[PDB]
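Chapter summary example: a protein plus adenosine monophosphate.
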Amino acid sequence: VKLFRASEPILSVLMWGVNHTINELSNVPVPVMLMPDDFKAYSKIKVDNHLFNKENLPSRFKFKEYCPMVFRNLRERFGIDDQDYQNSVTRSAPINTRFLTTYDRRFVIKTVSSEDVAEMHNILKKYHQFIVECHGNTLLPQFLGMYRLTVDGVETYMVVMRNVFSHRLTVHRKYDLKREASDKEKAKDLPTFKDNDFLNEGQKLHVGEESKKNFLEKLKRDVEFLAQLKIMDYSLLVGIHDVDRAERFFGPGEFDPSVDVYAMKSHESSPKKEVYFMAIIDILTNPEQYSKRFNEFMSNILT
Amino acid sequence: VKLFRASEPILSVLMWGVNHTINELSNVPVPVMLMPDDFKAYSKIKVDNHLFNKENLPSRFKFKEYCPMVFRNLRERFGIDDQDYQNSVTRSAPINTRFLTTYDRRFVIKTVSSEDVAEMHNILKKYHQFIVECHGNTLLPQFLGMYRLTVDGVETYMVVMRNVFSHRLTVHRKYDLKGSTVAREASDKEKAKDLPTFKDNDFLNEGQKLHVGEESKKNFLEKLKRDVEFLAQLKIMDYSLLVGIHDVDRAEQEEMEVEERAEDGPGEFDPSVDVYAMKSHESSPKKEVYFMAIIDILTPTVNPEQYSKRFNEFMSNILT
Ligand SMILES: Nc1ncnc2c1ncn2[C@@H]1O[C@H](COP(=O)(O)O)[C@@H](O)[C@H]1O
Ligand SMILES: Nc1ncnc2c1ncn2[C@@H]1O[C@H](COP(=O)(O)O)[C@@H](O)[C@H]1O
Ligand SMILES: Nc1ncnc2c1ncn2[C@@H]1O[C@H](COP(=O)(O)O)[C@@H](O)[C@H]1O
Ligand SMILES: Nc1ncnc2c1ncn2[C@@H]1O[C@H](COP(=O)(O)O)[C@@H](O)[C@H]1O
């Protein structure tokens, strides 16, 4: 029994919406291939409830899902089952209405702009074709579904993505990399440091050669693909989990690589014992040069 | 796993809508009591699926359910579980817009007018109450759900009810009985049907008589009188006793032939499922099963009190 209960009506609508569409899809055959129309398709559902089921849900709302066949295929290629995705959004309210995570920390939910949604349609075909070609092995943001909510006459656009960080292992310091950190921001529980703060601290990321080489083999293909699309101004979200600080149950630095898809252990010969998280964020809203600077500045953080 | 496949889009939307609303209801706690608003309540969902999921369903349609908290409770009082109900309607298309049976013959779906849907609201509080105090034991139609569908901008109203007939047993002869000082009979056009709808003077002419024995005749007649008085107060009339007759030996032979053609219980029913069914006594000529219920209590010189007594006198004579 799912009461779509959450801080605000908008989150309840989202939970209702993801639940309803994922169920609807369970009645849609998986096709042998995506067709051009799947990329201009949508589901729209309008709800008008009078004196019914309004304990958590507004009585009136709209929910629109863009290209459900495409995003369901994306979910599959990213190794995510529809029931788990549904459960993570729907079992319990997402937590902190501009940037959320599901209650299990597996997925992130980003409110975006109209033009952002237009940009996603513009790249969706190639993005898909690339996700296929690279067999789901990529540092790119992982687009899991995309939605428009209408509550109280107001439209809100959202994109669901795989959390870059672990959904268990606590992150102890985050670097946004392409410039330094604000003052009011350095006084947060977890500050968002930048390129300089990183090079200042002289931070280092030691990870088995394979991790570095393999990590860069892919980092390159991805960036090369973002340039091929004339995109830029995207950062590399980096998380650091320091094992000792957080130190029947789970173990230290223990994690399930099939879930925490972006996690990398320290080297057999490394200073502190750490788990690192890394992926590309914010690709929605020279650029060929952007890629090469990005690609080099990053390569110079891995030994 | 459900395609909502059907011969007409209206049926697909029906299957979709019952499926959808029963699932929503599953996430809605079952309340301690019903409230007055529950009798004024409704759900309305409008769908627009562009270039998506259009193999069986239309791209655009509307589904409205009246008073769903109430109908859920009615299903429960009638001993119908919501999942079974949903499955009977959705597992495979209903059969035969403007009168359908579910594929398993448990439920019936009647297309009704908007005047009918209004009468349902008018009488809904009393009807529910009446269902509570007779414990679900009635010959009356058992209303399980009420719906408005919109396809191609056209509105269609539907009521879902329990089948008067067995979902298993075959009916070999059937009657619609009101009983009046008028003329009621099977037209030369009806008799030409496989299962004709015979009426009052047919039943009298052929001198039929149903043999259920006293213990059942009494239980039955106590229901009728109460049911018909309730209808009486509500100022209702023009309803019939739907009578079906199953011949046990004739079905046993029918089954045998069904096997021979293909290859090349015995008059037993679950009174909890086949709710209107009565075995014949041990002193009956032919061995039979009967099905009897009141139908048509909404719009399709005598008065309503007269009718109740008259209708009741006739049915009383039918048994023995
Ligand atoms: N199938 C599509 N193809 C291209 N652009 C779209 C599509 N759907 C929505 N958009 C754009 O995304 C933004 C939001 O559109 P809407 O879903 O009407 O709110 C607008 O800029 C639309 O033009
Ligand atoms: N994929 C992601 N997983 C987890 N957290 C994220 C992700 N993308 C952005 N964030 C965080 O959410 C905040 C808003 O993102 P942005 O607006 O892109 O800076 C940032 O401070 C990030 O730390
Ligand atoms: N809550 C209600 N109480 C009484 N009559 C109603 C109610 N809802 C609908 N009706 C009647 O049912 C018919 C069709 O209703 P609708 O198309 O749902 O607005 C019309 O005669 C309405 O006035
Ligand atoms: N609840 C019911 N169960 C089975 N058959 C019914 C039921 N109601 C009506 N019928 C039959 O369906 C047809 C239409 O009924 P009506 O609309 O009352 O004339 C007639 O053949 C009736 O005998």
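Key point: The radius of gyration of chain A is 20 Å.
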